[PDB]
Amino acid sequence: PMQAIGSRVAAYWAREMQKIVFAELAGVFSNDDMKDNKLDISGTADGIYSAETF
Amino acid sequence: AYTKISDVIVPELFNPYVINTTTQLSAFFQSGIAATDDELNALAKKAGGGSTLNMPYWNDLDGDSQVLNDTDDLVPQKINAGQDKAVLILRGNAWSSHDLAATLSGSDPMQAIGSRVAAYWAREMQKIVFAELAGVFSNDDMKDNKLDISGTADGIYSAETFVDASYKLGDHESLLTAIGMHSATMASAVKQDLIEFVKDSQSGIRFPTYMNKRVIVDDSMPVETLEDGTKVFTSYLFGAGALGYAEGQPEVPTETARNALGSQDILINRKHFVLHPRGVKFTENAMAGTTPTDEELANGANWQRVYDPKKIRIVQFKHRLQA
């Protein structure tokens, strides 16, 4: 199981990168006044995420 | 330094690769012409500040030249109106960054940096031609026969007004290939209509298709604002097959030079090319220069056509979006 243990470590670290990057954005980009010019909040009675708001 | 066929500067073995790579990678193509004939590679050779060149029409047009019965000989012969004067333009720049970008690409960019510049001039050609047509064709009363609108309170651009605008050339058909588009429009379309995604040219992947016309996505479109929510869009329809262009050539295509009191070096290109619809004639008025004119001044006003009506070949229609 050379290729086996290799697989395992591989998928492990993949998962690492995934989580760390996503949370990395999460707790930062939005909590600020700084980026606020980059965020569309909207919601508020309509918009479905289709074809337009995109 | 490094290998750097630019910083060891072999002007040979480089420049032709650059221009060819520009032609292939760019699109359009087609749509418009690719590798125009000898004629224009000749008039593209020794020339100077124009005006431009001629640039014949196509059809010899005869079929008069009447009964040869007894006594005329024949009348040798008729030709119609003429000229079709246009512009010859000149462009160029350096490269923005240092050798930073240049070999930051890598070690031996025999093909890399070339690909770079190629794609660059691709985008260039795109912008210049697009803004050019937009600046001229629409605004005058002379072209009016090629524009449709409707575009007040009812129409969605689907399946019908496309038919009308498509057949506004009543004689000629199956001459539509390219279609110019604004993003929002094709949004409405991919919502309602069947516009599908087809790997079509071979090889390579891929790009959208409405009907077997190739479509061309573009960012820049004139967009108005009328009262009451309305927004009117342009999205030219031509796909004539074609426009035309010829190369010419400056001298010193690429020059490697550096500086001293700072740490940099600079690459430069400065190519000439000749492109325009035929099509309307370019007059000389209200323009500084020269040459070329400008972007803006190459648009704002003052062009004049002679055919008139057919074999232009372009059309536009301003349609209400999907509401």
The residue of chain B with its CA nearest to that of A54 is B187
**Considering only CA atoms, which of B243, B242, B247, B276 is closest in space to residue B42?**
B247
Method of structure determination: cryo-EM
Residue B91: count of CB within 10 angstroms of its CB? 15
Structure tokens that stand for B222 in this block: 């004139």
Pairing of strands B244-246, B232-233: unpaired
Q: Say how far apart CA B251 and CA B175 lie, in whole Å.
A: 38
Q: Which two tokens stand for residue A53?
A: 């708001």
Distance between CA B103 and CA B115 in Å, rounded? 13
Region for B23 from its dihedrals, namely left if φ exceeds 0, alpha if ψ lies in -120 to 50, beta otherwise:
alpha
Q: Look-up: residue for tokens 């059309």?
A: B315
Report which of B89, B90, B87 is spatially closest to residue B53, judged by C-alpha positions: B87
Please, which residues bridge with residue B237 across strands?
B315
Helix (H, G, I), strand (E, B) or coil at B245: strand
Report the C-alpha gap between B120 and B26 in whole angstroms. 9
Can you tell me the distance from the alpha carbon of B307 to that of B82, in angstroms, rounded to the nearest whole number?
8
Distance CA B144, CA B162 (A): 18
Which amino acid, residue A30?
A: S
Closest CA in chain A for residue B192: A51
List of chain A residues whose C-beta atoms are within 8 Å of the C-beta of residue B191 = 51
State the nearest Cα–Cα gap between A43 and chain B, in angstroms: 20
Q: B interface toward A at CB cutoff 8 Å?
A: 187, 191
H or E element, residue B160: none
Q: Search chain A and give the residue with CA nearest B187.
A: A51
Query: CA-CA distance, A40 to B5, in Å (whole number)?
Result: 48
Q: How far away is chain A from the Cα of B318, in angstroms, using its nearest Cα?
A: 21
Residues of B in contact with A51 (CB under 8 A): 187, 191
How many other CB atoms sit within 10 Å of the CB of residue B222? 14
Alpha-carbon gap, residue B201 to B212, rounded angstroms = 12
Residues from chain B contacting residue A52 (CB–CB below 8 Å): 187
Which residues make beta-bridge pairs with B268? Answer: B94
Chain A: residue whose CA lies nearest to B188: A51
State the count of interchain CB pairs (< 8 A) between A and B. Answer: 3
CA B106 to chain centre: 33
Q: Contact B135/B299 with Cβ under 8 angstroms?
A: yes
Residues of A within an 8 Å Cβ radius of B: 51-52
CA separation for the pair B310, B290 (Å, rounded): 32
- In our burial notation (b when 16+ CB lie closer than 10 A, e otherwise), range B241-271 reads ebbbbbbbeeeebbebeeeeeeeebbbebeb
| Nearest CA-CA distance, residue A51 and chain B, Å | 7
Contacts of B187 in chain A (CB under 8 A): 51-52
Number of H helices, E strands in chain A: 1, 0
